[PDB]
Amino acid sequence: KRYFPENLEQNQSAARLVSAVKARASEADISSIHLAIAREVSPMFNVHE
Amino acid sequence: MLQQPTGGYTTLEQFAFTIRNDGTNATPTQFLQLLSYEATENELVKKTIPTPETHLPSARNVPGNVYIEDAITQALFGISAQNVNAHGYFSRLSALALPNTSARLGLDGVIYNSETINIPFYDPAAVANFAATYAKLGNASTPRYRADMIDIYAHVGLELAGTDAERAAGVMPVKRAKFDSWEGSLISLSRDVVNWKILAFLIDLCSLEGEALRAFKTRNRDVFRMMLFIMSTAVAANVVNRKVTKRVDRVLEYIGVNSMRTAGRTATITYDLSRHEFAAKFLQLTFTRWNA
Amino acid sequence: NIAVAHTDHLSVVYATMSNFMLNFTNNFSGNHATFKPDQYVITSPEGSYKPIIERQGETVDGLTIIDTSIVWPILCQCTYPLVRQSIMEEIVYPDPSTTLSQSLSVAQVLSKLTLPDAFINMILSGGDSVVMRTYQTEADDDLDEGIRMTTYDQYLSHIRERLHITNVPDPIYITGASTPDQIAASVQATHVAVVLYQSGVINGPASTYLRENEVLVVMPDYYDVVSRFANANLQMNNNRYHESVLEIADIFDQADFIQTSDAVRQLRALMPTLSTSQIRHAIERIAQITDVDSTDYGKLTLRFLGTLTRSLKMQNAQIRRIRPDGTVLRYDDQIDIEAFRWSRYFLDELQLRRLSVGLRLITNPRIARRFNGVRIMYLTDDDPDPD
Amino acid sequence: IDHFAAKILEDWRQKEKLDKGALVEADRVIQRLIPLSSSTYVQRLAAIGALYPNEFTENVLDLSRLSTALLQLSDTYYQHANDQLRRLYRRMYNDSRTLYMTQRHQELLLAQITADPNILLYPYTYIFTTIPTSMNYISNTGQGRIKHSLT
Amino acid sequence: LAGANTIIAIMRLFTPQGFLRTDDLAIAANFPRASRNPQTYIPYTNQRGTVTNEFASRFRTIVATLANVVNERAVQDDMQKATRSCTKQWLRHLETQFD
Amino acid sequence: PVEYGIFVQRGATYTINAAGEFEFSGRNEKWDQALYLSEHFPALFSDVP
Numbered sequence A: 001k002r003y004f005p006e007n008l009e010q011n012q013s014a015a016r017l018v019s020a021v022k023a024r025a026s027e028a029d030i031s032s033i034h035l036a037i038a039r040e041v042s043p044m045f046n047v048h049e
Numbered sequence B: 001m002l003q004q005p006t007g008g009y010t011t012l013e014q015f016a017f018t019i020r021n022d023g024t025n026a027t028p029t030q031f032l033q034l035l036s037y038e039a040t041e042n043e044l045v046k047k048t049i050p051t052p053e054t055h056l057p058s059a060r061n062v063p064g065n066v067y068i069e070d071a072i073t074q075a076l077f078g079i080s081a082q083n084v085n086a087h088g089y090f091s092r093l094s095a096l097a098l099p100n101t102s103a104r105l106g107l108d109g110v111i112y113n114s115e116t117i118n119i120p121f122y123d124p125a126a127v128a129n130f131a132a133t134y135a136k137l138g139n140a141s142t143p144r145y146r147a148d149m150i151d152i153y154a155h156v157g158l159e160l161a162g163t164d165a166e167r168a169a170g171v172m173p174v175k176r177a178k179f180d181s182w183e184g185s186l187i188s189l190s191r192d193v194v195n196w197k198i199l200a201f202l203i204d205l206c207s208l209e210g211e212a213l214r215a216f217k218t219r220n221r222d223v224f225r226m227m228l229f230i231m232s233t234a235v236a237a238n239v240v241n242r243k244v245t246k247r248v249d250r251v252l253e254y255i256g257v258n259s260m261r262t263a264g265r266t267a268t269i270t271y272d273l274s275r276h277e278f279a280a281k282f283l284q285l286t287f288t289r290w291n292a
Numbered sequence C: 001n002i003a004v005a006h007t008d009h010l011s012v013v014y015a016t017m018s019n020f021m022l023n024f025t026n027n028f029s030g031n032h033a034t035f036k037p038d039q040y041v042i043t044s045p046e047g048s049y050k051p052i053i054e055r056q057g058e059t060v061d062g063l064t065i066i067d068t069s070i071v072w073p074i075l076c077q078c079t080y081p082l083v084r085q086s087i088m089e090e091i092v093y094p095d096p097s098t099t100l101s102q103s104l105s106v107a108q109v110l111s112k113l114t115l116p117d118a119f120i121n122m123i124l125s126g127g128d129s130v131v132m133r134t135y136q137t138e139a140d141d142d143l144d145e146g147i148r149m150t151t152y153d154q155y156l157s158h159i160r161e162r163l164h165i166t167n168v169p170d171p172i173y174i175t176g177a178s179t180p181d182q183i184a185a186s187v188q189a190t191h192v193a194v195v196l197y198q199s200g201v202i203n204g205p206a207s208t209y210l211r212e213n214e215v216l217v218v219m220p221d222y223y224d225v226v227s228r229f230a231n232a233n234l235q236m237n238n239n240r241y242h243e244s245v246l247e248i249a250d251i252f253d254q255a256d257f258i259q260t261s262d263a264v265r266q267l268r269a270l271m272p273t274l275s276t277s278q279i280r281h282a283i284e285r286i287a288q289i290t291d292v293d294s295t296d297y298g299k300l301t302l303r304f305l306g307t308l309t310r311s312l313k314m315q316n317a318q319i320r321r322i323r324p325d326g327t328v329l330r331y332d333d334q335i336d337i338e339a340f341r342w343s344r345y346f347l348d349e350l351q352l353r354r355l356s357v358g359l360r361l362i363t364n365p366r367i368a369r370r371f372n373g374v375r376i377m378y379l380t381d382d383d384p385d386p387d
Numbered sequence D: 001i002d003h004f005a006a007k008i009l010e011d012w013r014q015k016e017k018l019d020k021g022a023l024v025e026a027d028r029v030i031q032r033l034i035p036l037s038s039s040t041y042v043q044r045l046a047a048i049g050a051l052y053p054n055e056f057t058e059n060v061l062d063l064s065r066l067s068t069a070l071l072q073l074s075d076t077y078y079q080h081a082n083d084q085l086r087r088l089y090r091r092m093y094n095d096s097r098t099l100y101m102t103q104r105h106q107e108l109l110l111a112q113i114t115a116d117p118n119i120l121l122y123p124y125t126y127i128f129t130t131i132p133t134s135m136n137y138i139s140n141t142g143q144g145r146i147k148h149s150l151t
Numbered sequence E: 001l002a003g004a005n006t007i008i009a010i011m012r013l014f015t016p017q018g019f020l021r022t023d024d025l026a027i028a029a030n031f032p033r034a035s036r037n038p039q040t041y042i043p044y045t046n047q048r049g050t051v052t053n054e055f056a057s058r059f060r061t062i063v064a065t066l067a068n069v070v071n072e073r074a075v076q077d078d079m080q081k082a083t084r085s086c087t088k089q090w091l092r093h094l095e096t097q098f099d
Numbered sequence F: 001p002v003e004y005g006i007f008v009q010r011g012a013t014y015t016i017n018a019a020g021e022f023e024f025s026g027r028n029e030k031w032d033q034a035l036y037l038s039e040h041f042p043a044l045f046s047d048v049p
C-alpha cells in the first residue's frame, strides 16, 4: 500500500486524517478491480446504486 | 620599440578589434548594427562624472613581469575572473608613469621591469601618459577612492544605446537591447572581446591629442561601444531570448542600469563585487578621457 | 550568580556557532510580534511544491519537542567555568577543524547528491508541452501556418507558472479593440509569445500580426472559435485546424532556466516517449553508474538522512518563498537571495561551462554514427564502397 | 511601512509649507525615506510619497490609517486616468532607489551644497517636473454632517 | 450561479477527461447495437507529448483546488487545525502517486 | 478574568496586514503549531496595548 507519504502515517497530528483514509482504503482484490473496469463498459440493466 | 603612428596604435592592422559573427571576423561596428533597442518608461540622465583622484597607487616592489593586459581584460570581460582586488597588481601600471623609467610595456601586454630583447613595446612617452591615468585602476578597491558604480552606467547606456539626439541631450529612455543571436552569443562575444589588445586602444586614447585624437574617438567609437556592451550585459538585470518565427532574438535588459547582481548565470559573464568596483573605476577613468 | 557566566561566556559560543557553515537560516529578529521564518519551497511547475519548513511531525529522534523545564537546571543545578571563579578552570577553545570538516563533509555530500537527477531534468526541461490547435487563416497554408491557440486550462497548467518563475507581467487580454502594437508590447514585456483571448471579434490586422509572429492566443474554450475572429478573408474555418504538441522549449528560452540549445533538442528527438517512471529509472541508472566519492562522515550523514528522494517533482524546479497564506511568490530581486533566481538546474558553474563543450561534442557529425533507414535493391557488388 | 508612512506625512506637510512659500526651519529638504531594499508595498509608498499628490493637500485621504490610504492612493496612481501621473508613478516604482524630487527642492539642495561644500547627501536622484491637476476636491475630516443646498 | 461560484468550481473537478469514441469497428462488423448511432465515452486518451501527461496534470489542478479548499476551511479545534495541514500534505502526495 | 475577556474578545491571534496594520481574529481559538507557518501570530505577543 502507498496511501501515505513517509512518515505522516507515523505522525501524531495526522491520526485523524490517517484514520480517515484507512476508512476508505479498500484492500485490492483482482476480481473487484476487473469488475470495476468492466462495469465501466458493460450495459446496465438494473439501475446501479 | 613600436613607433606610434600619427593615428593611434589602433590604426595598425596588428591591433584589429573584431568579434566573431556569422562565421566571419566582423568588426564591432557591424555587430552593433544588429543591436536594436526597446525604450521603456524609465529615463537615464547622465550626472557629471567626478574627477578621478590625483593619487597614483604605489607599484609595490614586484620582480616579476606582470601580465597587465590579461588582468584588465579579464577583470572587465573575463568569464571566470573573481577577487580582482586581492592581488593588487594593477598598481604596477604606476611603475610606467615615471619619466625615463627602465620599465616598458610590451605589446604582449606585460609590464617588463627593464627593456628586454625581441619583445616589442609601446613608446614610453605614450605609455607614461596612459599609466598616469590608468594606474588609478590600482585604487579601484581602496575605500577612499572607489568609483560610483550606479550612476556611471547611465553614461554606458548613452554611449551604447543612445541616439545622437539622446547623446546630445544627455538623457535617454532606459532601453532594452536585442539582436538576432546564435547559441551562447554573449559568452562568445565577451571572449572575442577579452582577447582584444585593448592596451592599444587605451594608449591611443591617452597619448593622442588634437584633431588626431578626435579622429580616434570616431574611428574607435564602435569598439568602445562593444566593450560597453559586454560590460552592460555583465550588469544587465536579466537576459532572455525570444522566439521570433524560427529565429531567436537575445534581449538584455536593461542598458545603463547596473543591477548590482553577483550571482552567476549561463547567459553572460558575471561581476563579483570586486569586479563591480573595478569596472566602475575603469569606466570613470575611460569616460573621463573620452570627454575632453 | 549564574548570569555573570552566561552573558560573558555562552554568548561568544552563540556568536561563534552563528558563523558555522551549515547554519544558513536566520533564526530570529528579536521582535516576537512580527517575526516569522522565511518560507522557501522547491516549487515545480509540473508538480506540487515541497516546503522546506513543514510540520511533517517526524521527530528526528525526538529533536522537535521542547522541554521548557530545562531552564530550571540551568538556573539551578549546573555549573560554568566562569561561575566557579574560587577555582579557575581555563576556558576551552575547541579546534575549528572538527565542525569545519563535518560541515565540509555534509556540504560536499549533498552537493553531489542531486547530480544525476539534476542532469536528467536539465536535459528534459524543455520537454514539457501543450496541445495546441493551429487554424489556417488563408488559402494554401501549410498546417504549421496560421493562428496558434491553446485552451486556458493548458496555459494555466503549464505556461502560467513558468511565467511566474520568469518574473514577467501577465500577458494581455485581447478584446478585438487590440492594435497589433499593444500585442507586440505584451510579447516584449513578457518574452513568451502569448496573449490571452478575452471577448469580442478580433480585427484582421491583429489576426495577421498573431499569424505572422506565431503569437499563441489562449482561448477559454473551443466553441465556435471562428466567431472570435474577423475572418474577413473567409478562409478560416471551425473545422480547418491542426492539433499538435508544442514544447515549452519552443516558447520559453531562458538560459539558466530551460535548456534549449539545439544539441539538447536534437537529443530530445531521439528520446522515446517518456513517463515520470521512465525518467526516475533513468536517473537511478545514471546514479548507479557514478558511485560518488565520500568521506566516512559523509557516508554517515548519507545513511542518517537517509534514503528516498524520488517523491519530489523537479522538472523546472525553482526555489521560491511562499506567502504564509500559501501562495507561491515570484523571486523578489530585493528580498530573496540572488542565488535563488534560477536554480541553474541545480548544477555547479563549472559543470555548465563543460556542459556547453559536451553539447558541441554530441552535435558533432563524426560521432553521428547511428544510421537511419535502408534501401533494399538487387545490384551486383562490383566495386564496393560504404559511402 | 509605518516608518515610511510617517516620513511621507512629514515631507508632505513640509512641502505643503514650502509650496505656500513661507520660510521654514526644515531639517532637510526631503524629509521622506528612500528604500534601498524593501518589499513591493514600500516601493509603492516611496512612489506616491515622491509624487506629492494633490489628494494630500485636498485632505482626500484619511490619516487614521495613513499607510493604507497611501497604498490605495498608489493603486489609483498605478492606473491613473492621467497618463503623465501614471507613467510618473510607474517610473518612480521601477527605480525606487533613486530619490525623485521637484526642481524647487533641487535648488534648495544646491543652496545647501553651496553653504557646506563637503556635506553628504543622497547621490542617486531624479528631478521630475510636477504634473498640475485642476480638480479641487472638497474635504473636511472631523465631526459634522454636510447640509447640502442642491441647485 | 449568481453567488455559488465555489460550488460550481468544485463541481468542474468532476468533469471527465476522455473523449466520445463512436464504436467504429462494432458498426463495421454489424454487431448488435440498440443506439441509433453507437458510441462510448473513453475515460482518457494517449499522452500526446514526449513528457507531460494531460490526465496527471488535470489531477494536479484538482488537488491544487482541493488544497485551496482545505486551506480556506475554517476550524476551531486544534486537532482540526492540524489535520487541515496534514490533509494538505497528503493531497500533495496523492498527486505524485497519480502522476 | 476581566482583562482576559477584554483581551480575548480582540482575538487569540492576529495577522499583519499588507498595509502593516494588525488585524486580530476576534475569536478565542486554541493555538496549534500548524498555524506557526500560517499568517497568524499568537495575540499575547502582539505587544499592542
Ligand SMILES: Nc1nc2c(ncn2[C@@H]2O[C@H](COP(=O)(O)OP(=O)(O)OP(=O)(O)O)[C@@H](O)[C@H]2O)c(=O)[nH]1
Binding pocket: D040, D044, D047, D071, D074, D075, D076, D078, D090, D093
Ligand atoms: N507600483 C504599483 N504596482 C502595482 C500596484 N498594484 C498592482 N501592481 C502591480 O501588479 C502586480 C501584482 O498585482 P496584484 O496582485 O493584483 O496587486 P495586489 O497585491 O493584489 O494589490 P491590489 O492591486 O490593491 O489588489 C505587482 O507586481 C505590481 O507590479 C500598485 O498599487 N502600485
Ligand SMILES: [Mg+2]
Binding pocket: none
Ligand atoms: Mg526627525
